[PDB]
Chain length 352, copies 4
Amino acid sequence: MKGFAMLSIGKVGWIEKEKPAPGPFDAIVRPLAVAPCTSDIHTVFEGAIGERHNMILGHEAVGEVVEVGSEVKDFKPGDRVVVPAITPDWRTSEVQRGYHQHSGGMLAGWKFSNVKDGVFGEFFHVNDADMNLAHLPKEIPLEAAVMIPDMMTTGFHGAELADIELGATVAVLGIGPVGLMAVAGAKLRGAGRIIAVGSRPVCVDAAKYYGATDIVNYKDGPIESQIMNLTEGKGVDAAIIAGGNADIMATAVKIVKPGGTIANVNYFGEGEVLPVPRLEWGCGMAHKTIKGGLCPGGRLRMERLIDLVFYKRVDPSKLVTHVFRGFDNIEKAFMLMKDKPKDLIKPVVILA
Amino acid sequence: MKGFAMLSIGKVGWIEKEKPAPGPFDAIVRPLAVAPCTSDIHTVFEGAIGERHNMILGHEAVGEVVEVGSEVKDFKPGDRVVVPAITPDWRTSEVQRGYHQHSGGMLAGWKFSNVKDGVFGEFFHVNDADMNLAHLPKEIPLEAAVMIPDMMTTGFHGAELADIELGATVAVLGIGPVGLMAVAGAKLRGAGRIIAVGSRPVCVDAAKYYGATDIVNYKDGPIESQIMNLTEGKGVDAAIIAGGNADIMATAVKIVKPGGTIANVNYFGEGEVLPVPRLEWGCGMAHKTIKGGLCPGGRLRMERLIDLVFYKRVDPSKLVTHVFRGFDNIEKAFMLMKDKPKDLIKPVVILA
Amino acid sequence: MKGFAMLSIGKVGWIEKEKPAPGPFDAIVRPLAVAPCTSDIHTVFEGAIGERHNMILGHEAVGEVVEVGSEVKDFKPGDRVVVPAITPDWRTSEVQRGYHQHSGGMLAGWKFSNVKDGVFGEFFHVNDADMNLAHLPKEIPLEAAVMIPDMMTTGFHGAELADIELGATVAVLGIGPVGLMAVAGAKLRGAGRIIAVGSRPVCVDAAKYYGATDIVNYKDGPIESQIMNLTEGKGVDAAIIAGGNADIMATAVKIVKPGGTIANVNYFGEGEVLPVPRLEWGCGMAHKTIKGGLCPGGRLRMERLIDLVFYKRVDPSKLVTHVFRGFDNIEKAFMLMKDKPKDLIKPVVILA
Amino acid sequence: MKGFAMLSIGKVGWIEKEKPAPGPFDAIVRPLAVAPCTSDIHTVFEGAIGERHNMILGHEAVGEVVEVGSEVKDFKPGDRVVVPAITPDWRTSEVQRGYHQHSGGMLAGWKFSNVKDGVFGEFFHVNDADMNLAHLPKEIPLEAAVMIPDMMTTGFHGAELADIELGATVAVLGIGPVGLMAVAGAKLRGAGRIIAVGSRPVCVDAAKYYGATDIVNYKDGPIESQIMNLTEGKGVDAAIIAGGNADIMATAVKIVKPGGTIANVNYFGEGEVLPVPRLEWGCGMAHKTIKGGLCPGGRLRMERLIDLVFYKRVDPSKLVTHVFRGFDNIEKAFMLMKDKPKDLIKPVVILA
Ligand SMILES: [Cl-]
Ligand SMILES: [Cl-]
Ligand SMILES: [Cl-]
Ligand SMILES: [Cl-]
Ligand SMILES: [Mg+2]
Ligand SMILES: [Mg+2]
Ligand SMILES: [Mg+2]
Ligand SMILES: [Mg+2]
Ligand SMILES: [Zn+2]
Ligand SMILES: [Zn+2]
Ligand SMILES: [Zn+2]
Ligand SMILES: [Zn+2]
């Protein structure tokens, strides 16, 4: 089996492994469309996950079931499905506590390209298919559906974590593809004014498209000072962090009103301490709740979002700026993620 | 002072009372636009709230502050403001418990046209100006603003009480002006498929406009059996009741899945017991939570929805089907509410 | 294998079935202690759950794992374990919605003595041992442990659903074994004044022992008015229904303040509609949230409640008012529950 | 009027000011018992809240209404009341958002000894008497009652923020007088195992009394490793921070399992950044919510805790280790808090 993988930190390239075999509850899927995530980049050229040798990359795919186990009941070979980035083992302690994201350990929900070969192969292995796969309606285009596995649940679980109230003002720090979905999520939660913080013209134009009402470029002065003016010094009702480094946490706390929420879905890789300003955090009493969690995965999550797209509630189409064909391009698309052109948001390779 | 009021049960007609005086914290407002509510009808021709003599009617109004109290600080004469239906007394017990709608009593938050003279007068009295009035931006049309005081908050509170989840399937029972806002509400909470239950063609055409994805007319079979078909027998994740009589509660509990929520914002007046089917209510264990409450009021509440319209989040314009002029029409508009023409949703009289 | 079962409605008696075989993920447990539930009585002598033939009864058991499936990993033969009444199939949809009680259907989480042979046999079958069993520390006495599987979770789930707040005033309608644990539940959620509604002298004495501060005997006038008296017409903050018929739902709504919550864990069998007084329910607007759900089950639920006992948080012992020995007795103890002696609360049969 | 106050940072001593005059809705109270707060110490010898000149200190008092406003209706001279540390202005925006602690600004609800003269005087001023005062039952001793205004609400609010679940394991970092009330609050939220982290013997003896089941003395190794052991490496379900500096935040995040809650009610005064270890915070994805808010104040809050004491649900008595008589000792008591003797927890001076 041919598959684009991580060779060792700082080194990738196509390799060959043995086609996976489904367990009684698993399914083997053949990619139809995939996408590279900035996370893979950090995983390969920054060892964000530790050292890994010959691990196929990728965790965002839409495929066709080619083989199922003896115990799979809802998916048969030939079925078109959307595959979640998070594919947990549903029979664990934490699944009973309500946090499947952490089934069997912190961030254990995430398997693809972490402790299991990713989706960038001629085939890949999905565990517990009846629990972790969702059928793909034929009316939803491959390009768009692939934004569902990770971009859309991360952005949306940003908006979810914020406890956004009807007509509340929400600030989104980081307008990348995840931020763009976090902006759409704030709009899906009844957000009134949505202040998107970003500087890429391609990202800002998309943000306005998804509901952004005010754009804030940091190259105009401090973010906390700009948001404060925009809100007559009232601050925002919530702040969703979708990107940036450690610092961005301080910004968040400073622009959020007392009793406000700061929801984080960004993956910090630098330093070892995320800054929480004690003065603006009411010396630990301003009731500014800070949240931060991995995006939900699993069938239901996928089906939920799939309806959101099916009923024109949101269209992830705008996130895809590049489209390529054939496996060979999985590599071209990948690198494209390492050096973000000013016209790039999210590339996708149809696998025809 | 001139004002259209309720004389005796079944009897209305213009009367004259003394122009009200502000307290140190209250304000006097001169209406700029108002709307009759079916409530008033029930209040007069059905004494839904008891016997009342010479009570100026109306509780939905957008006006101008003509006179403030000595202690009012955020409102002066000349200011255009939206006056919420619910204008509670913020210094009570229930306010500390978080239920201003019941400040000082059950539904005591509601004063206008209940224990206070309505807004259908040359002038009306608004208690606690700084806590119960909200500035109306010039860009928002009066026809529209007037829908915020009661229709939008009630409709929206329906969605709010429902505990909708991203992608969740919501069913709204009753597509009246309130139900229509409940349909926009659910869509504002990120509902996916929204099933609107109603028959009036003028109502359904709006329902589609506000997010309904499927129309269910009881004239085609039992509602419960239809929703069950549309949802492959899965049922809905939540059902908002915005109209109907006692029965409808049974429908609700029957269409919602175990674990779902039945949110009610409808005003039931007959019978003395609301039906909750034990069988499909899991014999008291299918976790189908039932909620029901008076719409929130107050400045903040209004502010929030004012922003929703301000940010083209939702447009209440479509609720206004008829626009009249001058006080005199407050009566034609009132009657018009009694006998709902097949082309009427919500009548509004401008400038008086 | 010998086992006391339900032959047909109104008829019970011992029968013999073949000893169950564990699936790769199940376990075979040998009871060490068990207890009859009023639900068995109704299930048999009132077909509360339909016609059943040769169905071993009982669902509250403590025992020893005698055989495990090839895939079980946390349980081995010889282990002492507490077995939850609810033993769901954790790989279902509703488990992703957060309601394992309804995994695969409304109330589907409950298998023992419903769709699966009960625990009143020389052996019984527990599905998904790692997800549905919990180790029993030797320091906890069997008489006590057996109260955890159903009585404890149900009563505690009463308090839980009640949304009790520190110092809140709770009322427990029905002080049977479940009400008793609902009384300890409220105390566990930091309830201040706890009003227990009941007449049996043996129950009231236990109620006082678990935290009730006032006793209300319906034999002294209408409950609704008596509680109104005790609370200067303020009413209670929440009302936990732990027994009664359908009429109790009304009493509940009537004693709860606007914004309060009615939490019901009682299994209603009569009639086909649970009354909800529209008047005192604010005509559908006093915000009186009504909740009612089956008790949670599974390993975790059992581990949590086990620690409560282990750390002397609560002592179920007082619930056990009779102790028998040997299977023979499983029948005498069964009958004992049909005709509640004025000195009975909960009988338990030791060792098998 | 005689009163012990803050002359300027680092300097204190009695001073004289004019007896305060009640506004239409206020009340003047004469102290019957009061107590020093570690915070006054910081506020004075560490300017934790800025420079201040001649500000009467203290915020924890039980007194006698000596004069009420013309508008006050629930309080008359002679009445014995408990006066909450937090005494907000109930007619603000933040109050409609449900955070009276921040009425008029961040932490703005805390007036006493912050922006208003404290309770350490012959008389003191209480704004909004009907909203911010609560009657003290004669059965509750003064020593005990003075522990309600700040210690109890803060400790309890810690447990409240933690989102503790029945049987959940909770850790309390810091067992000071507030931490002792968080240990009590945890037990009041249904906690099973409660791990108290502290070294002062008089504090641990009290900790055990309030429900602590395990004592962790940092002088035996790293707290995180000790808790990890005690918990088989599982970690705690919640961590309430009631003392320590910045670092303690790191400890919390390191001992709480994924999906756990770090609830802070500690007042941090050093540095400008509270540490949040990215590694063990799941790099911003371990779903380890961090909370932290000012203790609730107001009449209702006080009435709730008063009931808790009235129904022997908790007894603050053991927090009081010293008692003194007359004003003169308010200073002896104050200094007693600056240099914590090994036998001190909370000093109270009776008869003002
Ligand atoms: Cl704003
Ligand atoms: Cl559907
Ligand atoms: Cl009371
Ligand atoms: Cl443990
Ligand atoms: Mg579909
Ligand atoms: Mg505006
Ligand atoms: Mg243990
Ligand atoms: Mg009392
Ligand atoms: Zn990416
Ligand atoms: Zn109307
Ligand atoms: Zn029973
Ligand atoms: Zn203190």
